[PDB]
Design a binder for this molecule. Structure first.
Ligand code: PCG
Length: 142
């Protein structure tokens, strides 16, 4: 029963692109720590400017990223968000809005997030942030 849920969560995580660098211990912590929630269409999962404590992974549906009234992108299944506030100890840099009903996210707190990214995952997260900031900066020149 608990073994079933462990089995299922391990099976899914082992398949996921973003978690491909997890050590066995990091994977164990993630399986034990994550929780899930469902959002309705239009729900603000994250609001820009607020303190954040959670890292999110989309398991169903799509979300919109909006910053200063500008749409930045749409994220989908097996994408993550909410990493910037936790990495840099800063308020949320953008809002994240559920685009449809029944969007489901997994999430872990900051302590778990910091522990499970150690290794190659950290460097990949920071690289993506750099590229994102670069394109947004150039996009805004128009
Ligand atoms: N500032 C910013 N955040 C983004 C972008 N794309 C998706 N996001 C996510 O939106 C989130 C806002 O909360 P965080 O700042 O903690 O982390 C952010 C990211 O994970 C982007 O191009 N710029």
């Amino acid at each position: 029963d608990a073994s079933i849920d462990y089995n299922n969560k391990k099976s899914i995580i082992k398949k996921m692109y973003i978690f491909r660098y997890l050590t066995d211990k990091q994977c164990n912590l993630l399986i034990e720590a994550f929780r899930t929630t469902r959002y309705e269409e239009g729900d603000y999962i994250i609001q820009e400017g607020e303190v954040g404590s959670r890292f999110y992974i989309i398991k169903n549906g799509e979300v919109e990223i909006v910053k200063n009234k500008k749409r930045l992108r749409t994220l989908g299944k097996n994408d993550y968000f909410g990493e910037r506030a936790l990495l840099y100890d800063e308020p949320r840099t953008a809002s994240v809005i559920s685009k449809v009903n029944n969007v489901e996210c997994w999430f872990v707190d900051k302590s778990v997030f910091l522990q499970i990214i150690q290794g190659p995952m950290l460097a990949h997260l920071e690289e993506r942030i750099k590229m994102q900031d670069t394109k947004v900066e150039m996009d805004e020149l128009e």
